[PDB]
Design a binder for this molecule. Structure first.
Ligand SMILES: Nc1ncnc2c1ncn2[C@@H]1O[C@H](COP(=O)(O)OP(=O)(O)OP(=O)(O)O)[C@@H](O)[C@H]1O
Ligand SMILES: Nc1ncnc2c1ncn2[C@@H]1O[C@H](COP(=O)(O)OP(=O)(O)OP(=O)(O)O)[C@@H](O)[C@H]1O
Ligand SMILES: Nc1ncnc2c1ncn2[C@@H]1O[C@H](COP(=O)(O)OP(=O)(O)OP(=O)(O)O)[C@@H](O)[C@H]1O
Ligand SMILES: Nc1ncnc2c1ncn2[C@@H]1O[C@H](COP(=O)(O)OP(=O)(O)O)[C@@H](O)[C@H]1O
Ligand SMILES: [Mg+2]
Ligand SMILES: [Mg+2]
Lengths: 564, 311, 24, 265
């Protein structure tokens, strides 16, 4: 064809073909491009915005506005060629080969006189054709962009404008920063209704009105590394690609099952099984947690809030201080919660707060700041939640942190986000934060009976009451009663049998033997670790002597009679 | 730009439209709306920022919410609120997150959390949450802002703050200001907790900060603990969280006057009133609906009412 | 005593490969 | 090894262009003792800057010609090597590594080379980094098999900071401590060098000049070491005598010391 067609595509001729997506909205942004393009000296609008806001789609909406006739008469019938700089450098082996193939482009624009060049990725203009010798494409274009011999719409991101164009301060002045902002959800549902015809044509499925409202709403709060126009388009496009692999309609709920399989955040209307399990959530968490009934039905109600669609979209899903005596199930409930929501307690994000003993290990929560080592790894808590935003985040022994480790979590527990050292606010909104604080016999002085208010007010003296107001529920745990230690014996014997006696050996305990373990393992002030030390002192060390001696060995059922 | 007459009546009713998100807090909303009215009228000093506020007082009574309410009035969202906090900046070298690394140290081309967001929109409400929980070297760097409205980055370039609304939310005023009664004998409320107590919040800022940081900050507003009259109006605002998009889909949550009264009675602290009301509506309303939506006693196509059948 | 060392990692001073201009 | 990045110190010692080395005869034996090893035969000369570490090797390069070799150092040419000169001119990839693999190719083909590299603090990080290809990754396989005889020179701090902090570099260079010489040893250095300084400046340096240069340099100069701060005094005094023109004494080296240090008279 011609020179311009070799290196770019005529985006107006492709708009006459209808191969461009229709652009709803953006009328302030397109009229701002055309009023920059109509200027005398610099008529070069760079379209800067976050990656995803549709700053390419503005010119895609401009190339339509030319060929629809919505364009002013000073930009009437002007062919808007995009420019692949990679097509210009390709095959430019020889010395003047890139410069001539760039000046042939520019001679063609001045010859025709109806060309609006569109250099997408304007940060790649500097260094285009850079080598050991020859002049890059930016320093070629510098006299033409300032004097007005060339109309060039730029479209770079905000990061790439700062990293590569603002570091070339002569090139920055020769463009006009047109702030292509991230559209609102009310603007995105007009994008999506305008794009409904292009996805009903491609996927051969009709996307309902509620699914456009859902995909723009659900993408705003459940995604924060991507921008509204695209990430809401990503939910309509992929749910349209659900239904074309099952062939009718793309439901409101068809969007939420795409988002739920993408972030990992369950946002869909519940399966009949999952509805019954979540009303069984107390009695399923009691399969591991013996006792601690108000501890379970405080942390089970937080998951019922998230799954009933009553999660506060600013606040995290749950924020708990599991205070109480050492060994009664603070960490075990955080593991029983993580097994309930995920299937294993290895999905529990456990930040062991005893490691943070001074003020400067807070750089492990959010990583190093710029200019320091460990900046590239960007945090050992923030990056655990960018991958899994639906997470139970355990802060084990938060009392043993410094007094301003947890002051770094004062925006985590109301605003629901923590700014990374690299500069990324990460959504702690879909997390369940748990702060297990650890709070011997009787206290000072005369008192009847013998407690929870001693634990509550010690949190007021240790923790800063900015941090306590952000906690949803402070749960002081119970002493494990003797009727709960008997049930705890059955749980810990169920550890050594079946998981550690897969030797064709079966472990059976008589009811007098479980009563003897409960009478030896029961001390109110510790709870369930003296029981666990009893079982490895009465049962499974005498049993390990019987396996090595092969008194009772592999292929034989062990019964445990009572010793005395 | 010269004011559209619709926008002028918004600035004249700026207090009343910030009181649609802030309940109570009379002189707090007022002294912030005065900073926007002296800016759009063209009466701003062109050597200082548009507003340099300290929101001192009890934690979570509207300090960060007025900063979000101000960002709603000026932009329509809280995503234009440049909330670079200060309670994660406890070390001196975390000031390189505000400014970026100097060139030749990693993260210098992308560095700057504060200054690169302010350079995009110089008219930006900048919130500094928990300003006292930063290292003292950040203040000496942020003293450059309050004198000139210009600030040198790590890269060695300037950035305009003469149009920002700087808000230095300080949680100072929680030692015995977080305690409702003070020390010793005195009369009832407003004589033991605002005429015994607001001097101590001003004293805790004069000792923690250098004076030239406070002299250039043009408003220091100790905030009010919320009265029971300022809680009954908040329950109407907190139900609107629940009865909105969380319950808008084919359900309608209306609460009786008996039910709004119990939340104001159970969610009242005489030091607080935003967060314990947020918790008691979460515990007594929002946990009860979460069980009833999943068990489908309250489903789509119903109007669930809440009352108190105990009195 | 509790004076922290401030690692202060430099940006990478690294080599560059070359596109070359072809000649006869 | 080419004469581009260093020079042949044994060919210089055969022509007698190197400094006569009086003293350090015990240190040269310790270098020969490390160089006579089958593996790890790499003596690093640990000494303060300007204590005569090259003068150990200049005397060692003479001992190749004088025949004081252990018959495993016989007819071994000793090319000195500026390690930083291979670094200079490297902004693109494979600039340092090509010029380092060339000079190691010219050792396997020639077969009698003893490199003297100074600045072994430059060895760690001669390229981009340690995970990148540096000279502290190319030399190391041949420094453990004895197929490459390199004589080193650090300070003591450069040896602590760059070699003792480097795993697998302590074991490949064997420390030879070139000490700081005493005042009488320094005079005997100056007694051997005077046939060069009296023939270069065309002056006569008296015996009283050197007993003063070994005393006044320790007495007044503390930022720099003796077997250099004493050589310098009878060097510049011969140049000042050539400039003012002839006999150097403890009055001619006197005003040379008064030029630097803040002494009005
Ligand atoms: N106003 C709009 N109307 C219709 N579609 C839009 C609009 N804005 C963006 N889009 C669509 O959103 C998607 C974003 O792609 P686009 O290239 O426009 O984004 P961008 O902001 O240029 O991102 P990047 O900087 O990563 O290239 C495309 O499918 C585009 O058509
Ligand atoms: N509620 C419980 N249900 C089941 N097992 C329990 C319970 N409490 C304690 N145990 C047993 O004892 C162990 C200690 O429980 P857990 O790890 O939760 O301690 P903790 O309460 O966090 O104590 P600490 O104060 O030392 O952190 C459990 O792993 C389990 O073996
Ligand atoms: N006018 C109001 N006064 C008080 N709390 C409010 C108001 N409007 C909303 N809230 C609720 O209070 C919560 C806390 O935000 P708020 O700005 O009140 O905190 P704060 O006063 O800054 O306290 P902190 O010292 O903990 O930062 C908000 O998330 C919101 O749910
Ligand atoms: N025996 C000797 N010991 C030390 N230096 C000597 C000796 N003989 C001559 N010199 C002088 O040593 C200098 C060579 O530099 P050198 O002292 O080896 O530096 P560095 O100790 O820093 O390696 C020259 O001035 C030379 O004349
Ligand atoms: Mg524990
Ligand atoms: Mg706040």
């Amino acid at each position: 064809s011609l020179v311009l067609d070799q290196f770019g595509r005529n985006l107006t001729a492709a708009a006459m073909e209808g191969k461009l997506d229709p652009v709803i909205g953006r009328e302030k942004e397109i009229e701002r491009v055309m009023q920059v393009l109509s200027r005398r000296t610099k008529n070069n609008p760079v379209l800067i915005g976050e990656p995803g806001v549709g700053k390419t789609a503005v010119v895609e909406g401009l190339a339509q506005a030319i060929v629809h006739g919505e364009v002013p008469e000073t930009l009437k019938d002007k062919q808007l060629y995009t420019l692949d700089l990679g097509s210009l450098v390709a095959g430019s082996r020889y010395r003047g080969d890139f410069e001539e193939r760039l000046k042939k482009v520019l001679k063609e624009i001045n010859t025709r006189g109806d060309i609006i060049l569109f250099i997408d990725a304007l940060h790649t203009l500097v260094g285009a054709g850079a080598a050991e010798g020859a002049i890059d494409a930016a320093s070629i274009l510098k006299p033409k962009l300032a004097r007005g011999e060339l109309q060039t719409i730029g479209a770079t991101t905000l990061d790439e404008y700062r990293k590569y164009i603002e570091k070339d301060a002569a090139l920055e002045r020769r463009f006009q920063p047109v702030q292509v902002g991230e559209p609102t959800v009310e603007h995105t549902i007009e994008i999506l209704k305008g794009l409904r015809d292009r996805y009903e044509a491609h996927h051969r499925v009709s996307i309902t009105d509620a699914a456009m409202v859902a995909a723009a709403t659900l993408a705003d709060r459940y995604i924060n590394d991507r921008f509204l126009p695209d990430k809401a388009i990503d939910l309509i496009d992929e749910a349209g690609a659900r239904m074309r692999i099952r062939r009718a309609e793309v439901d409101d709920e068809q969007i939420a099952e795409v988002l739920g399989n993408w972030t990992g955040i369950p946002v869909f209307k519940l399966t009949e099984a999952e509805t019954t399990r979540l009303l069984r959530m107390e009695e399923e968490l009691h399969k591991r947690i013996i006792g601690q009934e108000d501890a379970v039905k405080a942390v089970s109600k937080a998951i019922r809030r998230t799954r009933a669609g009553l999660k506060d979209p600013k606040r995290p899903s749950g924020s708990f201080i599991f205070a109480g005596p050492s060994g009664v199930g603070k960490t075990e409930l955080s593991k029983a919660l993580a097994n309930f929501l995920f299937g294993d307690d290895d999905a529990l994000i456990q930040i062991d707060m005893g490691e943070f003993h001074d003020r400067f290990t807070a750089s492990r929560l959010f990583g190093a700041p710029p200019g320091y080592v460990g900046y590239e790894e960007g945090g050992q808590l923030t990056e655990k939640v960018r991958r899994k935003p639906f997470s139970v985040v355990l802060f084990d022994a938060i009392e043993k942190a410094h007094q301003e480790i947890y002051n770094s979590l004062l925006q985590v527990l109301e605003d629901g986000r923590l700014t990374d050292g690299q500069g990324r606010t990460v959504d702690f909104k879909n997390t369940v934060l748990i702060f297990t604080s650890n709070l011997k016999p009787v206290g000072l002085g005369f008192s009847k009976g013998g407690m929870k208010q001693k634990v509550n007010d010690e949190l007021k003296k240790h923790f800063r009451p900015e941090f306590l107001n952000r906690i949803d529920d402070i749960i002081v745990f119970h002493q494990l009663t003797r009727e709960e230690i008997i049930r705890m014996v059955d749980l810990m014997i169920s550890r050594v049998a079946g998981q550690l006696k897969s030797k064709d050996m079966a472990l059976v305990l008589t009811d007098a033997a479980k009563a003897l373990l409960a009478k030896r393992g029961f001390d109110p002030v510790l709870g369930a670790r003296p029981l666990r030390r009893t079982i490895q002192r009465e049962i499974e060390d005498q049993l390990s002597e019987k396996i090595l001696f092969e008194e009772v060995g592999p292929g034989q059922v062990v019964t445990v009679d009572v010793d005395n | 730009f010269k004011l559209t007459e619709a926008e002028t009546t918004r600035l004249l009713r700026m207090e009343e439209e910030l009181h649609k998100r802030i309940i109570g807090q009379e002189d707090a909303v007022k002294a912030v709306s005065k900073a926007i009215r002296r800016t759009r009228a063209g009466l701003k000093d062109p050597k200082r920022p548009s507003g340099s506020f300290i929101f001192a007082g009890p934690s979570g009574v509207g300090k960060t919410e007025l900063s979000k309410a101000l960002a709603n009035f000026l932009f329509g969202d809280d995503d234009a609120l440049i909330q670079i906090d200060m309670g994660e900046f406890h070390d001196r070298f975390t000031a390189s997150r505000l400014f970026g690394a100097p060139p030749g140290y990693v993260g210098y081309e992308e560095g700057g959390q504060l200054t690169e967001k302010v350079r995009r929109k110089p008219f930006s409400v900048v919130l500094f949450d928990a300003i006292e929980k930063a290292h003292q070297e950040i203040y000496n760097s942020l003293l450059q802002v309050l004198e000139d409205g210009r600030l040198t980055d790590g890269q060695g370039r300037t950035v305009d703050f003469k149009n920002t609304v700087l808000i230095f939310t300080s949680n100072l005023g929680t030692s015995d200001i977080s305690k409702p009664v003070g020390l010793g004998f005195s009369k009832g409320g407003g004589e033991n907790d605002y005429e015994r107590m607001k001097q101590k919040v001003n004293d805790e800022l004069k000792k923690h900060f250098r004076p030239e940081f406070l002299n250039r900050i043009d408003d220091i507003i100790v905030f009010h603990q919320l009265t029971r009259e300022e809680i009954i109006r908040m329950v109407d605002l907190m139900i609107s969280r629940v009865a909105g998009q969380l319950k808008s889909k084919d359900m309608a949550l209306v609460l009786t006057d008996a039910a709004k009264a119990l939340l104001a009675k159970r969610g009242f602290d005489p030091v607080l009133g935003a967060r314990p009301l947020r918790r008691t509506i979460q515990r007594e309303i929002e946990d009860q609906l979460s069980e009833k939506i999943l068990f489908e006693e309250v489903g789509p196509g119903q109007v669930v009412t809440v009352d108190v059948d105990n009195w | 005593m509790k004076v922290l060392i401030l690692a202060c990692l430099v940006a990478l001073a690294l080599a560059r490969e070359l596109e070359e201009l072809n000649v006869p």
